[PDB]
Ligand binder design. Structure first.
Ligand SMILES: Cn1ncc(C(=O)NCc2ccccn2)c1C(=O)Nc1ccn2cc(-c3ccccc3)nc2n1
Ligand SMILES: [Mg+2]
Ligand SMILES: [Zn+2]
Length: 313
């Protein structure tokens, strides 16, 4: 009840900033996550015995892949923490509870391969889930862990508040399927410009929460340049491995995943910042003004990639 988590002074201050890096000490990430839940929700939102046991079960069910790992899980939840703390009054008690958990669980049991590779492989999960394959799997694993004896962190909610929170978490996690982001932001784009955006419309919140989820999930591009630069190795190690596997099936992968075309990475990063990241954080800044630092940090990094191309690094 009266047992706060407290971080050292530098973390205490820096964690409140969008660009905060959780650091290389694995053992502090669970305490960082609890620290965030407590400030974002209350010391009452979850029984600490159960929360702690849910966190360690989620950790166990992430794999040791270069990028889609436990570190990513907590990185994505912190960005969401930054968005919720900078938009105090816009979100319900339920939404603050459900979205930090959604972020922590959003890539549960990822294998470091795209939906596409599952499909070209004919992986069972592709038969069981035709679209958003890994994302439906990740929601399924979240529910599995919630149902372990001692792991139901929501058990204190009324029957309908529990259905409302599982429904938020499900939509939240499906939304991290980037194939659904493009149409989600086009609609949010039109809805904000024509002036029909209405946050009391549940189908409109859904869309907004979906874009928040895309923004947290991509937040590697919103760090200080050295974090972004070294992180990018990790995502390319999954991409190239998938390219290797595509080649093993007898399929030339897309260049993104062809390790023979490492050279064209800075150009490929440019396309991505322009086609995905900038549009994402632009539309997010328009709908939620206090998220502006993510857009600015993203633009700084776009600019840092242009510098790489020009030979200046
Ligand atoms: C999905 N998803 N999720 C996150 C990211 C990402 O790259 N995020 C950026 C970050 C992630 C982790 C750490 C640092 N920076 C992406 C993505 O599709 N990126 C991309 C997108 C398109 N491409 C094209 C190439 C390319 C590379 C070499 C030669 C030719 C082309 N390269 C591409 N890369
Ligand atoms: Mg994912
Ligand atoms: Zn993710």
């Amino acid at each position: 009840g009266l047992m706060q988590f407290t971080l050292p002074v530098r973390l205490c201050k820096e964690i409140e900033l969008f660009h905060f890096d959780i650091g290389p000490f694995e053992n502090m990430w669970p305490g960082i996550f609890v620290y965030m839940v407590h400030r974002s929700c209350g010391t009452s939102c979850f029984e600490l015995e159960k929360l702690c046991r849910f966190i360690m079960s989620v950790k166990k069910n992430y794999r040791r892949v270069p990028y889609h790992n436990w570190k990513h899980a907590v990185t994505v939840a912190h960005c969401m923490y930054a968005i919720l703390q900078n938009n105090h009054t816009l979100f319900t008690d339920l939404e603050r509870k459900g979205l930090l958990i959604a972020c922590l669980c959003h890539d549960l049991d990822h294998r470091g391969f795209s939906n596409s590779y599952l499909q070209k492989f004919d992986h069972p999960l592709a038969a069981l889930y035709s679209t958003s394959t890994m994302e439906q799997h990740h929601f399924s694993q979240t529910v599995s862990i919630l149902q372990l004896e001692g792991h139901n962190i929501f058990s204190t909610l009324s029957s309908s508040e529990y259905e409302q929170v599982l429904e938020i978490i499900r939509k939240a996690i499906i939304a991290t399927d980037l194939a659904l982001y493009f149409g989600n932001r086009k609609q949010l784009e039109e809805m904000y410009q024509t002036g029909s955006l209405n946050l009391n419309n549940q189908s409109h919140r859904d869309r907004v929460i979906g874009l928040m989820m895309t923004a947290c999930d991509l937040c590697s591009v919103t760090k200080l340049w050295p974090v972004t630069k070294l992180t990018a190795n990790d995502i390319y190690a999954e991409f190239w491995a998938e390219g290797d596997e595509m080649k093993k099936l007898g399929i030339q992968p897309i260049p993104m995943m062809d390790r023979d075309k490492k050279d064209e990475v800075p150009q490929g990063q440019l396309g991505f910042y322009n086609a995905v990241a900038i549009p994402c954080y632009t539309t997010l800044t328009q709908i939620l003004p206090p998220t502006e630092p993510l857009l600015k940090a993203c633009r700084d990094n776009l600019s840092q990639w242009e510098k790489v191309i020009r030979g200046e690094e």
